[PDB]
Design an enzyme around this catalytic site. Structure first.
Site, PDB file in Angstrom:
ATOM      1  N   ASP A   1      -8.871   7.106 -12.291  1.00  0.00           N
ATOM      2  CA  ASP A   1      -8.118   7.513 -11.112  1.00  0.00           C
ATOM      3  C   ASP A   1      -6.732   6.877 -11.086  1.00  0.00           C
ATOM      4  O   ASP A   1      -6.493   5.923 -10.348  1.00  0.00           O
ATOM      5  CB  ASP A   1      -8.888   7.146  -9.840  1.00  0.00           C
ATOM      6  CG  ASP A   1      -8.192   7.614  -8.576  1.00  0.00           C
ATOM      7  OD1 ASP A   1      -7.421   8.597  -8.644  1.00  0.00           O
ATOM      8  OD2 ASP A   1      -8.419   6.998  -7.513  1.00  0.00           O
TER       9      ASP A   1
ATOM     10  N   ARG B   1      -0.853   5.898  -5.415  1.00  0.00           N
ATOM     11  CA  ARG B   1      -1.512   5.053  -4.427  1.00  0.00           C
ATOM     12  C   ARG B   1      -2.224   3.877  -5.091  1.00  0.00           C
ATOM     13  O   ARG B   1      -2.673   2.951  -4.418  1.00  0.00           O
ATOM     14  CB  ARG B   1      -2.502   5.875  -3.598  1.00  0.00           C
TER      15      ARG B   1
ATOM     16  N   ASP C   1      -6.768  -1.695  -9.560  1.00  0.00           N
ATOM     17  CA  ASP C   1      -8.078  -1.052  -9.619  1.00  0.00           C
ATOM     18  C   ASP C   1      -8.427  -0.544 -11.014  1.00  0.00           C
ATOM     19  O   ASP C   1      -8.989   0.540 -11.166  1.00  0.00           O
ATOM     20  CB  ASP C   1      -8.154   0.101  -8.614  1.00  0.00           C
ATOM     21  CG  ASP C   1      -8.105  -0.376  -7.176  1.00  0.00           C
ATOM     22  OD1 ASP C   1      -8.597  -1.491  -6.901  1.00  0.00           O
ATOM     23  OD2 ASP C   1      -7.576   0.365  -6.322  1.00  0.00           O
TER      24      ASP C   1
HETATM   25  C1  LIG Z   1      -7.372  -3.523  -4.632  1.00  0.00           C
HETATM   26  O1  LIG Z   1      -6.282  -2.809  -4.065  1.00  0.00           O
HETATM   27  C2  LIG Z   1      -6.209  -2.884  -2.627  1.00  0.00           C
HETATM   28  C3  LIG Z   1      -5.102  -3.874  -2.248  1.00  0.00           C
HETATM   29  N1  LIG Z   1      -4.244  -4.053  -3.312  1.00  0.00           N
HETATM   30  C4  LIG Z   1      -3.343  -5.219  -3.356  1.00  0.00           C
HETATM   31  C5  LIG Z   1      -2.350  -5.399  -2.356  1.00  0.00           C
HETATM   32  C6  LIG Z   1      -1.483  -6.526  -2.429  1.00  0.00           C
HETATM   33  N2  LIG Z   1      -0.467  -6.775  -1.441  1.00  0.00           N
HETATM   34  C7  LIG Z   1       0.102  -5.854  -0.609  1.00  0.00           C
HETATM   35  O2  LIG Z   1      -0.212  -4.704  -0.651  1.00  0.00           O
HETATM   36  N3  LIG Z   1       1.098  -6.208   0.342  1.00  0.00           N
HETATM   37  C8  LIG Z   1       1.535  -5.175   1.054  1.00  0.00           C
HETATM   38  C9  LIG Z   1       2.532  -5.322   2.054  1.00  0.00           C
HETATM   39  C10 LIG Z   1       3.066  -6.646   2.283  1.00  0.00           C
HETATM   40  C11 LIG Z   1       2.569  -7.754   1.487  1.00  0.00           C
HETATM   41  C12 LIG Z   1       3.087  -9.104   1.688  1.00  0.00           C
HETATM   42  C13 LIG Z   1       2.579 -10.143   0.897  1.00  0.00           C
HETATM   43  C14 LIG Z   1       1.605  -9.838  -0.071  1.00  0.00           C
HETATM   44  C15 LIG Z   1       1.082 -11.039  -0.860  1.00  0.00           C
HETATM   45  O3  LIG Z   1       1.909 -12.176  -1.004  1.00  0.00           O
HETATM   46  C16 LIG Z   1      -0.344 -11.284  -0.795  1.00  0.00           C
HETATM   47  F1  LIG Z   1      -0.809 -10.877   0.434  1.00  0.00           F
HETATM   48  F2  LIG Z   1      -0.557 -12.590  -0.924  1.00  0.00           F
HETATM   49  F3  LIG Z   1      -1.023 -10.591  -1.781  1.00  0.00           F
HETATM   50  N4  LIG Z   1       1.132  -8.583  -0.216  1.00  0.00           N
HETATM   51  C17 LIG Z   1       1.597  -7.528   0.532  1.00  0.00           C
HETATM   52  N5  LIG Z   1      -1.601  -7.395  -3.390  1.00  0.00           N
HETATM   53  C18 LIG Z   1      -2.514  -7.268  -4.347  1.00  0.00           C
HETATM   54  C19 LIG Z   1      -3.424  -6.176  -4.373  1.00  0.00           C
HETATM   55  C20 LIG Z   1      -4.436  -6.079  -5.475  1.00  0.00           C
HETATM   56  N6  LIG Z   1      -5.199  -6.011  -6.312  1.00  0.00           N
END
Ligand SMILES: COCCNc1cc(NC(=O)N2CCCc3ccc(C(=O)C(F)(F)F)nc32)ncc1CN
Length: 263
Positions: free
Chosen positions: A141, A145, A159
């Protein structure tokens, strides 16, 4: 769960914050001493954790897969794990700017993202996929996104541990391969150069299979160059063997990237 001296990270240096995303759980966190050079440094990290799961084996499987794949600039890398003295924590790199789809839509002209930057985005994802392929990993996938954006505008595939994105042989026959990933990459290309557009606009998903079977594909995005659209079309070949490999995609995209960077 055994201790891995190569990945075991102390909980006492890990501070958790607000929940991130939704569901499994990914939380905002603060890590201390992730970089062995400066143990007293604080960095913001993402922690994948398990309160109503039976799913521990799933998280452990992902962890070990991440260890096995290795690290790469363009994938969400494992930083450390907490298997001892408490609940299971899987600490991975952060992407402060969320996924590629929302990242592109927020920067849409009625153009904060120059064209060379777009080609760069695509190139990076193509690089991460090539690496994932060589490390024997099908996604399958792959979509915008699923591609995350860091503060340095680095593309990072997540992922690696939906009909609009699936190759025909995957849809009907449940056959998932490297070449099915390439099909999806074609869709991601279209996603990028539409600045986060939804594939096959205004087309019912039940009509999609017929359209694909009838040899129809998506049109060229309004201001997309022929070369980049040509790559999309090659990804969208019915025959998997007639689709490009990620190696060819990386080279083709590098060819454009370097060229566009001129003027
Ligand atoms: C598994 O996928 C669902 C979420 N995905 C992730 C999402 C994120 N972080 C993330 O989307 N954001 C979005 C918006 C603002 C933001 C601000 C800080 C941080 C990071 O410093 C922290 F949160 F520590 F990962 N991350 C985010 N980091 C790592 C992963 C994944 N493996």
């Amino acid at each position: 769960l055994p201790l891995d001296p190569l990945w075991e990270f102390p909980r006492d240096r890990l501070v958790l914050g607000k929940p991130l995303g939704e569901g499994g759980q990914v939380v905002r966190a603060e890590a201390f001493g992730m970089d062995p050079a400066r143990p007293d440094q604080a960095s913001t990290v993402a922690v994948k954790m398990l309160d109503n799961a039976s799913d521990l084996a799933d998280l452990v499987s992902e962890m070990e897969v991440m260890k096995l794949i290795g690290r790469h600039k363009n994938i969400i890398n494992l930083l450390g794990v907490c298997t001892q003295e408490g609940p299971l924590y899987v600490i991975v790199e952060c992407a402060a700017k969320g996924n590629l789809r929302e990242f592109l839509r927020a920067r849409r002209p009625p153009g904060p993202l120059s064209f060379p930057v777009l080609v760069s985005c695509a190139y990076q994802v193509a690089r991460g996929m090539q690496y994932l392929e060589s490390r024997k990993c099908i996604h399958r996938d792959l979509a915008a996104r699923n591609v995350l954006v860091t503060e340095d505008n680095v593309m990072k595939i997540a992922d690696f541990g939906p009909v609009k994105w699936m190759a025909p042989e995957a849809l009907f026959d449940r056959v998932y391969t490297h070449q099915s990933d390439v099909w999806s990459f074609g869709i991601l290309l279209w996603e990028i150069f539409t600045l986060g557009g939804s594939p096959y606009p205004g087309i019912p998903v039940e009509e999609l299979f017929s359209l694909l079977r009838e040899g129809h594909r998506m049109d060229r995005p309004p201001h997309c160059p022929p070369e980049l659209y040509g790559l999309m079309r090659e990804c969208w070949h019915a025959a998997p063997s007639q689709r490009p490999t990620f190696k060819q995609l990386v080279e083709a995209l590098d060819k454009v990237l370097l060229a566009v960077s001129e003027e």
